[PDB]
Design an enzyme around this catalytic site. Structure first.
Site, PDB file in Angstrom:
ATOM      1  N   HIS A  19       0.813  -1.212   0.000  1.00 25.29           N
ATOM      2  CA  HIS A  19       0.000   0.000   0.000  1.00 25.29           C
ATOM      3  C   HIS A  19       0.854   1.274   0.000  1.00 25.29           C
ATOM      4  CE1 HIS A  19       0.616  -0.121   4.465  1.00 25.29           C
ATOM      5  NE2 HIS A  19       0.644   1.188   4.282  1.00 25.29           N
ATOM      6  N   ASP A  42      -0.598  -7.414   1.084  1.00 27.20           N
ATOM      7  CA  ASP A  42      -0.047  -6.082   1.285  1.00 27.20           C
ATOM      8  C   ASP A  42       1.463  -6.234   1.193  1.00 27.20           C
ATOM      9  OD1 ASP A  42       0.435  -3.455   1.739  1.00 27.20           O
ATOM     10  OD2 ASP A  42      -0.464  -3.363   3.742  1.00 27.20           O
ATOM     11  N   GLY A  76       3.460   5.662   9.074  1.00 30.66           N
ATOM     12  CA  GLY A  76       4.806   5.870   8.586  1.00 30.66           C
ATOM     13  C   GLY A  76       5.599   4.600   8.828  1.00 30.66           C
ATOM     14  N   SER A 105       4.615   1.656   8.367  1.00 32.92           N
ATOM     15  CA  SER A 105       4.297   0.624   7.384  1.00 32.92           C
ATOM     16  C   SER A 105       5.490   0.262   6.512  1.00 32.92           C
ATOM     17  CB  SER A 105       3.132   1.058   6.502  1.00 32.92           C
ATOM     18  OG  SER A 105       1.904   0.630   7.079  1.00 32.92           O
ATOM     19  N   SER A 111       1.958  -3.676   8.021  1.00 26.36           N
ATOM     20  CA  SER A 111       0.851  -3.374   7.123  1.00 26.36           C
ATOM     21  C   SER A 111      -0.102  -2.328   7.691  1.00 26.36           C
ATOM     22  CB  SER A 111       0.061  -4.650   6.810  1.00 26.36           C
ATOM     23  OG  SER A 111      -1.079  -4.340   6.036  1.00 26.36           O
TER      24      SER A 111
END
Lengths: 198, 154
Positions: free
Chosen positions: A36, A63, A141, A143, A159
């Site tokens: 993402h 993801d 952030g 992720s 994720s």
């Protein structure tokens, strides 16, 4: 630049995410991160310099994604841990209830345990299945960031989770945190990647 | 090393407890398939657990009799539903959603509590209830639980 897990990188000079783990696909260098975080071809930059572009990605559903970098990049088998660095020694999946820590540019290095596997997440963008849940806190952030065991076994990339108004779930008790991450192995295996270990 | 501090900080795992913890973590990984085969279709999952004294142990669950395992150091627990059982319920929810679900955060099989957990936003239990019912899943094998904040990619 020095490709290390846990550091911040920008995409299309517009959004922020964290590096997952350094990997190689044959002679090609690269790093895994959350899907993402960007779309194919999107440009990735570390500290201002272009290091590479998103080579592939899946989101929602899964993801995951990986960035193929330029030859000038330096891949280190490490994960940022504040000022220190944990050494990545493998990708052996830990069991539910195991101690696990994560690194990301927003909340740093936090530990917790794995509380559930094969979680289906109802993200506004669409459901993502097969995620692993832990109770270490995180924030926006973070992720793409690394999740690793105390012994250096790479678990996966951050994720999402149930963040609060402050943008993270560090303010709520561990017993109520839902921090999800995509399992590493299926990423390496889908894109035929090989983890950089030390 | 510098990781040792984080373990003590967020997990209350102290230095003298590290080796036992590590040993328990290795056992869960190396025995998992063995524990699964041993209990066959009555298998209800396994996981690492912490006692109130500090020590850790590997727990294996079963829907049948069992009472014990062929592998030492594996506290066995008898539970109602089997993994295959809970998995079918999980599949029913994944399908029901495959057709959005405001208030519903996520769902997963949780062997630890021998049930399929459905997390919903605070005061959204109703949507959870409806989700389960509309999926025709045995509400007996499904636990709805409130979760603070909003689930989102980060």
């Amino acid at each position: 630049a020095n490709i290390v897990g846990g550091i911040e990188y920008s995409i299309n000079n517009a959004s922020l995410c964290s590096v997952g783990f350094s990997v190689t696909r044959g002679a090609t260098k690269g790093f895994v991160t959350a899907g993402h975080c960007g779309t194919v071809n999107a440009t990735a930059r570390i500290g201002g310099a272009v290091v590479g572009t998103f080579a592939a990605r899946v989101f929602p559903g899964n993801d995951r994604a990986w960035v193929s970098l330029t030859s000038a990049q330096t891949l280190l088998p490490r994960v940022a841990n504040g000022s220190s660095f944990v050494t990545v020694r493998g990708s052996t999946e830990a069991a539910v209830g195991a101690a696990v820590c994560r690194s990301g540019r927003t909340t740093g290095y936090q530990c917790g345990t794995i509380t559930a596997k094969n979680v289906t997440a109802n993200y506004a963008e669409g459901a993502v299945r097969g995620l692993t849940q832990g109770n270490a806190c995180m924030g926006r952030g973070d992720s793409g960031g690394s999740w690793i065991t105390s012994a250096g076994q790479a678990q996966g990339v951050a994720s999402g989770g149930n963040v609060q108004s402050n943008g993270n779930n560090c303010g709520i008790p561990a017993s109520q945190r839902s921090s999800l991450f995509e399992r590493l192995q299926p990423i390496l295996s889908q894109y035929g990647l090989s983890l950089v270990t030390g | 090393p510098q990781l040792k501090f984080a373990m003590q900080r967020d997990l209350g795992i102290f230095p003298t407890q590290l080796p036992q913890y590590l040993q328990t973590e290795k056992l869960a990984r190396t025995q998992a398939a063995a524990i699964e085969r041993e209990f066959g279709a009555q298998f209800a999952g396994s996981w690492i657990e912490r006692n109130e004294d500090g020590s850790f142990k590997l727990v294996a669950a079963t829907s049948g009799a069992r009472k014990s395992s062929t592998l030492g150091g594996v506290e066995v627990r008898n539970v109602r539903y089997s993994l295959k059982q809970l998995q079918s319920a999980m599949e029913q929810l994944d399908a029901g959603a495959n057709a959005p679900l405001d208030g519903v955060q996520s769902w997963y099989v949780d062997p630890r509590s021998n049930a399929v957990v459905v997390k919903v936003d605070d005061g959204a239990t109703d949507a959870g209830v409806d989700f389960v019912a509309l999926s025709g899943a045995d509400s007996a094998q499904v636990r709805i639980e409130s979760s603070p904040g909003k689930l989102q990619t980060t």
